[PDB]
């Protein structure tokens, strides 16, 4: 079922990629924490979906964001060799549910979902699934509700002590082709007790027929071990954050807890 159809830019992520570091409720407080966060005012790699779906490094954790209207980006593949030799993690959002599996998958040279559209540009139907040819020795399976003006979706992927932890946020965006300037904290989505080695990942697109895609783009950044001062409002929501390693002004604010 594999189709051998073959032939970046950077943006400024001002104050984004911050997530609730734990599950402890806090309010009306400035709290200092140390964890893996996206550095402020960093160079985030910008890809377009003609589509770009290369294999990217995972490093110590991945900040992933997408802007789209037609729901082209459906999921991700995480692993090492990304073939039948090792276990790998497949996260895909289908028409009704999100399917998360860990198996010895044999992925296609260029994996994707094969869909077609109605005469209108809102409805769609599946034709086939062209991501892998096999899925042997499955160890983990989880099914839940889908992860899903353009739609902005942000995810943070961490892998600590065997747990693949996903944080997320979904907001509307009124920009044409870039990330918003402002602050928004990501919330815990799911904790997956998997126990596998991840060094690389790939983005899965829904393509249609040879095969093409509509207008969409996504951004990839990386997390670093940095100190942040998080501002919790009266309702316990983080409304601001200071990157203590950004500049001398932030250092002063973090030192004085203000």
């Amino acid at each position, epitope marked *: 079922q594999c189709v051998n159809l073959t032939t970046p830019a950077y943006t400024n992520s001002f104050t984004r990629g911050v997530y609730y570091p734990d599950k402890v409720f806090r309010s009306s407080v400035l709290h200092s924490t140390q964890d893996l966060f996206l550095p402020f005012f960093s160079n985030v790699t910008w890809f377009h979906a003609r589509f770009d779906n290369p294999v990217l490094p995972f490093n110590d954790g991945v900040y992933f964001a997408s802007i789209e209207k037609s*729901n082209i980006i459906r999921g991700w593949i995480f692993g090492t060799t990304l073939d039948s030799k090792t276990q790998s993690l497949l996260i895909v959002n*289908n*028409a*009704t*549910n999100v399917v998360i599996k860990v198996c010895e998958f044999q992925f296609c040279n260029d994996p994707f979902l094969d869909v077609y559209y*109605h*005469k*209108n540009n*809102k*409805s*769609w*139907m*599946k034709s086939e699934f062209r991501v892998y040819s096999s899925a042997n020795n499955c160890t983990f399976e989880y099914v839940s509700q889908p992860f899903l003006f353009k739609n902005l979706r942000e995810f943070v992927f961490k892998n600590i002590d065997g747990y693949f932890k996903i944080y997320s946020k979904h907001t509307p965006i009124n920009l044409v082709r870039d990330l918003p300037q402002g602050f928004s904290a990501l919330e815990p989505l799911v904790d997956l007790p998997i126990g596998i080695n991840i060094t690389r990942f790939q983005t899965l697109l829904a393509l249609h027929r040879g095969w093409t895609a509509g207008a969409a783009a996504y951004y990839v950044g990386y997390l670093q071990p940095r100190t942040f001062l998080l501002k919790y409002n009266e309702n316990g929501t983080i409304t601001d954050a200071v990157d203590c390693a950004l500049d001398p002004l932030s250092e002063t604010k973090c030192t004085l807890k203000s």
Partner: antibody
Amino acid sequence: QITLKESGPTLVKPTQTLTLTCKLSGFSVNTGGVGVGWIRQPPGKALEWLALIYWNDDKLYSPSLKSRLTVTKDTSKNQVVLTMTNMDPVDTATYYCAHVLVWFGEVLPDAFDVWGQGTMVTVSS
Amino acid sequence: SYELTQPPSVSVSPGQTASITCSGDKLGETYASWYQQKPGQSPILVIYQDNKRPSGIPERFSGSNSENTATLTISGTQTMDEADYYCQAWDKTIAGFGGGTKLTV
């Protein structure tokens, strides 16, 4: 394979309520993308669509008959039940249930691939 | 319901091509489908989404949909193709079947 089986009363009186049950196999009513519709065909006449139910309990009805039609599904028995009230002699027809192909995103009905055998219901005194 | 019109009947000689039309208001915007019903039997899907066949349907059956008119064509019509043919179209979840065309051979 996929199959559907209609059952229920084959005779009702005027002003009585008819209940028809569609017993299905090969798929579950709780499975995403699944829908089951009801269609009737009076002797010598064309098919008329009545209603269909989606796996997510969303429902579609024919505007001209909506006021007399209720559709529910049994999530344990894999059965779809159609209730049609206040029937008149003119409502005599063969009733069918069938599988519905469904479009996603903006959810729409497409076509009926697998049909049941159908059951004949007469309305008379 | 959705308004949808068919010819009352079509009559061809064996070996000829049968053509059954189906006229609506918005068939150029939505998808049409066709069913074949034999006497005493439930209808069988022959064409869906304008021109796609289900597995098991003979290559004799084809069709199209343009200018708000849909058609079903039977090439090399056989005497075993005698049946009542119906067209269907959905207008934004509003169903509608045509009157049905009796095809004789």
